[PDB]
């Protein structure tokens, strides 16, 4: 707010547009990193009403319904960790083109898919496959047979859930 | 509009040197934006005190230009070093690595030239048409409980194959295609069908 | 909006990709009335896999597909002079543009290394064959 | 106005009013002879880096 | 008077803007890791170590 | 290229270039990874 400042400025050249520029690119690059990060998905997958798993327990990870947005418990516990505009000269904030929302629908998207379809939905489209048979596949993978997840199947989804339970806990301790 | 990435880079480059060879025309406070025309028209004494002032305004503009350009350089480096990476994986070889040489399953990959650049033709293979299938863990036989070697057990409603995963052909079940593990009262989701001896 | 305020287009109630980031999710797109339109973006088409405990999709049958990728390498060299540039044939200048020490040599240095590296760059992405080989005829 | 470097004949056409030359990026092409109507390309004396 | 101020406060914005430069390059590098742990881990199995 | 500044012609002109890329086409048409590693 000066008619003689910004008279004076502008002998200096075009010192006021480079840095103008150089934030806006700045800016685009922060939208893009979110943009190629999270959306990998065509379709938004959901699971199926009735959770059949093997005995495995996704409850602490799936999307909760009744909180107003559809976060899960642990994105809720990770959201309260992070603690913190007010400034009135030539500063400002500009919002980010993906709210939260968009983003907790990507992740439930991108989970919902790993669960019922494993990696076939990141080739193709995605194929149905039951959980139990999903972990045998992934057990082959590291050179162990799957006739020893078939025979220990009710000690996996237990060690899985207390593993689950204690992630849990641990990020609601520390902070 | 394919090729925006490499023509931004020639861009940026122009937009640079243009700006840079338009700074010179800037008085930053000085009489005249021409030292010749200030050496011919006043007194050392202060002719120098005009120079000094068009000195520091262009030095601080060629500062400001030395340091964008290293700043970009480092950026064109990292690319070039991914770049590198996928002539060596993709190019030299088949890579398991998934979408880093393009999405579905990598087969080959193809380089061609570019200015300032390269491209790669990946070549991916996609499965096409689905069915509906109804699997099981396992079978038992008589009391035992065979798993596929390698493929998975399926049905079309009367009758029990074993097929690879990633392409539907199906095979009778048989002691070539199993292998045995102990009894069948610890499976879950087990079916028990004959399985054919050779 | 939640971005501000946007004058000249018309709220609609639907939800498309999006064509024109605005923020805060609304997107800009210019429909056929042949007006601009601001709705709400949309993240993709709605799926639901058919999970079941005892069934599987297996493809019966496959597509070959080539896809492009195309990334820079390297960006064009340059090289500039101190004098020339700052003081370009005047002695009086010259003469006292030496009286800020070595501010030019650590410029043409680090403008050397960039040149440098702009080659050892093409360098180490294309050069990868011990031997030129050729196909049959 | 002073300033260095080689006058070329030139082939382009001026206005009966128009008497100094611009280029892309505010360089000057000095034109008219204060004592004909000839046309000049000034041009930088050529210069490298040994 | 104002000449001092005009200096000194654009050449904080040039630091403040090269400092930003620098840190939006290095979060660029952690988002291409992100990035690529969620095309390779989550999408997929990953046969690489650790 | 008038006011001191200059631009340097790069080390592999566009021939050079278009070789590597076909050596490399003609090496994995007709001879798989295995020019990678070895011979
Ligand atoms: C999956 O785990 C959740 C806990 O994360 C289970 O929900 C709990 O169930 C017990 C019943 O013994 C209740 O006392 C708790 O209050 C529940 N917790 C919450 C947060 O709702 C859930 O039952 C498990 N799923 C199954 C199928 O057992
Ligand atoms: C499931 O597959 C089996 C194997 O092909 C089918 O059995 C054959 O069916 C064809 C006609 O559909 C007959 O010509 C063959 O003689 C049958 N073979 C045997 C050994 O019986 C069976 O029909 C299929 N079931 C369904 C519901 O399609
Ligand atoms: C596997 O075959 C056996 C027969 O060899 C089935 O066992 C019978 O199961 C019924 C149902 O509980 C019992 O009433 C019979 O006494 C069982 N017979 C024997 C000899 O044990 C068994 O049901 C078959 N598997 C499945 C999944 O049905
Ligand atoms: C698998 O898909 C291919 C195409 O992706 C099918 O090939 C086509 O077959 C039809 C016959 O119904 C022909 O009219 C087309 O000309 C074929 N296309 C090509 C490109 O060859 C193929 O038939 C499919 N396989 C099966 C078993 O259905
Ligand atoms: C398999 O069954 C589901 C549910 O009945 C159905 O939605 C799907 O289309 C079926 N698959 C095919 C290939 O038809
Ligand atoms: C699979 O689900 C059905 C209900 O849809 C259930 O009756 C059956 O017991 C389940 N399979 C196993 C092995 O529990
Ligand atoms: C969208 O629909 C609501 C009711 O569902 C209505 O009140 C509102 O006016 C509609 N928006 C527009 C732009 O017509
Ligand atoms: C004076 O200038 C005019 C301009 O064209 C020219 O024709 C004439 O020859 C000049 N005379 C002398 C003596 O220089």
Same mark, same amino acid.
């Not at chain 1, 997958?45 to 909760?64: A, C, E, H, R, V």
């Not at chain 3, 003469?95 to 290394?113: E, W």
């Not at chain 4, 070329?8 to 030359?21: A, D, H, I, V």
């Given at each position: 707010?000066?008619?003689?400042?910004?008279?004076?400025?502008?002998?200096?050249?075009?010192?006021?547009?480079?840095?103008?520029?150089?934030?806006?690119?700045?800016?685009?690059?922060?939208?893009?990193?979110?943009?190629?990060? =999270?959306?990998?998905?065509?379709?938004?997958?959901?699971?199926?009403?009735?959770?059949?798993?093997?005995?495995?327990?996704?409850?602490?990870?799936?999307?909760?319904?009744?909180?107003?947005?559809?976060?899960?418990?642990?994105?809720?516990?990770?959201?309260?960790?992070?603690?913190?505009?007010?400034?009135?000269?030539?500063?400002?904030?500009?919002?980010?083109?993906?709210?939260?929302?968009?983003?907790?629908?990507?992740?439930? @998207?991108?989970?919902?898919?790993?669960?019922?379809?494993?990696?076939?939905?990141?080739?193709?489209?995605?194929?149905?496959?039951?959980?139990?048979?999903?972990?045998?596949?992934?057990?082959?993978?590291?050179?162990?047979?799957?006739?020893?997840?078939?025979?220990?199947?009710?000690?996996?989804?237990?060690? =899985?859930?207390?593993?689950?339970?204690? !992630?849990?806990?641990?990020?609601?301790?520390?902070? | 509009?394919?090729?925006?990435?490499?023509?931004?880079?020639?861009?940026?480059?122009?937009?640079?040197?243009?700006?840079?060879?338009?700074?010179?025309?800037?008085?930053?406070?000085?009489?005249?934006?021409?030292?010749?025309?200030?050496?011919?028209?006043?007194?050392?004494?202060?002719?120098?005190?005009? !120079?000094?002032?068009?000195?520091?305004?262009?030095?601080?503009?060629?500062?400001?230009?030395?340091?964008?350009?290293?700043?970009?350089?480092?950026?064109?480096?990292?690319? @070039?070093?991914?770049?590198?990476?996928?002539?060596?994986?993709?190019?030299?070889?088949?890579?398991?690595?998934?979408?880093?040489?393009?999405?579905?399953?990598?087969?080959?990959?193809?380089?061609?030239?570019?200015?300032?650049?390269?491209?790669?033709?990946?070549?991916?293979?996609?499965?096409?048409?689905?069915?509906?299938?109804?699997?099981?863990?396992?079978?038992?036989?008589?009391?035992?409980?065979?798993?596929?070697?390698?493929?998975?057990?399926?049905?079309?409603?009367?009758?029990?194959?074993?097929?690879?995963?990633?392409?539907?052909?199906?095979?009778?079940?048989?002691?070539?295609?199993?292998?045995?593990?102990?009894?069948?009262?610890?499976?879950?989701?087990?079916?028990?069908?004959?399985?054919?001896?050779? | 909006?939640? @971005?501000?305020?946007?004058?000249?287009?018309?709220?609609?109630?639907?939800?498309?990709?999006?064509?024109?980031?605005?923020?805060?999710?609304?997107?800009?797109?210019?429909?056929?009335?042949?007006?601009?339109?601001?709705?709400?973006?949309?993240?993709?088409?709605?799926?639901?896999?058919?999970?079941?405990?005892?069934?599987?999709?297996?493809?019966?049958?496959?597509?070959?597909?080539?896809?492009?990728?195309?990334?820079?390498?390297?960006?064009?060299?340059?090289?500039?002079?101190?004098?020339?540039?700052?003081?370009?044939?005047?002695?009086?200048?010259?003469?006292?543009?030496?009286?800020?020490?070595?501010?030019?040599?650590?410029?043409?240095?680090?403008?050397?290394?960039?040149?440098?590296?702009?080659?050892?760059?093409?360098?180490?992405?294309?050069?990868?064959?011990?031997?030129?080989?050729?196909?049959?005829? | 106005?002073?300033?260095?470097?080689?006058?070329?004949?030139?082939?382009?056409?001026?206005?009966?009013?128009?008497?100094?030359?611009?280029?892309?990026?505010?360089?000057?092409?000095?034109?008219?002879?204060?004592?004909?109507?000839?046309?000049?390309? !000034?041009?930088?004396?050529?210069?490298?880096?040994?």
């Amino acid at each position: 707010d000066s008619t003689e400042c910004s008279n004076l400025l502008l002998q200096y050249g075009s010192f006021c547009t480079q840095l103008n520029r150089a934030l806006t690119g700045i800016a685009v690059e922060q939208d893009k990193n979110t943009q190629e990060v =999270f959306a990998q998905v065509k379709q938004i997958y959901k699971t199926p009403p009735i959770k059949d798993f093997g005995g495995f327990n996704f409850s602490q990870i799936l999307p909760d319904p009744s909180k107003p947005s559809k976060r899960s418990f642990i994105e809720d516990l990770l959201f309260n960790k992070v603690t913190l505009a007010q400034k009135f000269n030539g500063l400002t904030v500009l919002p980010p083109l993906l709210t939260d929302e968009m983003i907790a629908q990507y992740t439930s @998207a991108l989970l919902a898919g790993t669960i019922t379809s494993g990696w076939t939905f990141g080739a193709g489209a995605a194929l149905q496959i039951p959980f139990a048979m999903q972990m045998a596949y992934r057990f082959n993978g590291i050179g162990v047979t799957q006739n020893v997840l078939y025979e220990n199947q009710k000690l996996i989804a237990n060690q =899985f859930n207390s593993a689950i339970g204690k !992630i849990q806990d641990s990020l609601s301790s520390t902070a | 509009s394919a090729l925006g990435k490499l023509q931004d880079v020639v861009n940026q480059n122009a937009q640079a040197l243009n700006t840079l060879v338009k700074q010179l025309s800037s008085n930053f406070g000085a009489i005249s934006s021409v030292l010749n025309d200030i050496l011919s028209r006043l007194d050392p004494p202060e002719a120098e005190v005009q !120079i000094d002032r068009l000195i520091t305004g262009r030095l601080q503009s060629l500062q400001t230009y030395v340091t964008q350009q290293l700043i970009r350089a480092a950026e064109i480096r990292a690319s @070039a070093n991914l770049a590198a990476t996928k002539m060596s994986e993709c190019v030299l070889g088949q890579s398991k690595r998934v979408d880093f040489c393009g999405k579905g399953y990598h087969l080959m990959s193809f380089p061609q030239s570019a200015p300032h650049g390269v491209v790669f033709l990946h070549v991916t293979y996609v499965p096409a048409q689905e069915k509906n299938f109804t699997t099981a863990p396992a079978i038992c036989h008589d009391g035992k409980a065979h798993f596929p070697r390698e493929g998975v057990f399926v049905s079309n409603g009367t009758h029990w194959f074993v097929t690879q995963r990633n392409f539907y052909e199906p095979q009778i079940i048989t002691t070539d295609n199993t292998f045995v593990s102990g009894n069948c009262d610890v499976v879950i989701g087990i079916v028990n069908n004959t399985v054919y001896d050779p | 909006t939640r @971005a501000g305020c946007l004058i000249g287009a018309e709220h609609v109630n639907n939800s498309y990709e999006c064509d024109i980031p605005i923020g805060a999710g609304i997107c800009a797109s210019y429909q056929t009335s042949q007006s601009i339109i601001a709705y709400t973006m949309s993240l993709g088409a709605e799926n639901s896999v058919a999970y079941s405990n005892n069934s599987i999709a297996i493809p019966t049958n496959f597509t070959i597909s080539v896809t492009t990728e195309i990334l820079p390498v390297s960006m064009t060299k340059t090289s500039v002079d101190c004098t020339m540039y700052i003081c370009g044939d005047s002695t009086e200048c010259s003469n006292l543009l030496l009286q800020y020490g070595s501010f030019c040599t650590q410029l043409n240095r680090a403008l050397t290394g960039i040149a440098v590296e702009q080659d050892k760059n093409t360098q180490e992405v294309f050069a990868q064959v011990k031997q030129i080989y050729k196909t049959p005829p | 106005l002073t300033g260095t470097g080689v006058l070329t004949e030139s082939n382009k056409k001026f206005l009966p009013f128009q008497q100094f030359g611009r280029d892309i990026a505010d360089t000057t092409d000095a034109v008219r002879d204060p004592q004909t109507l000839e046309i000049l390309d !000034i041009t930088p004396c050529s210069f490298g880096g040994v």
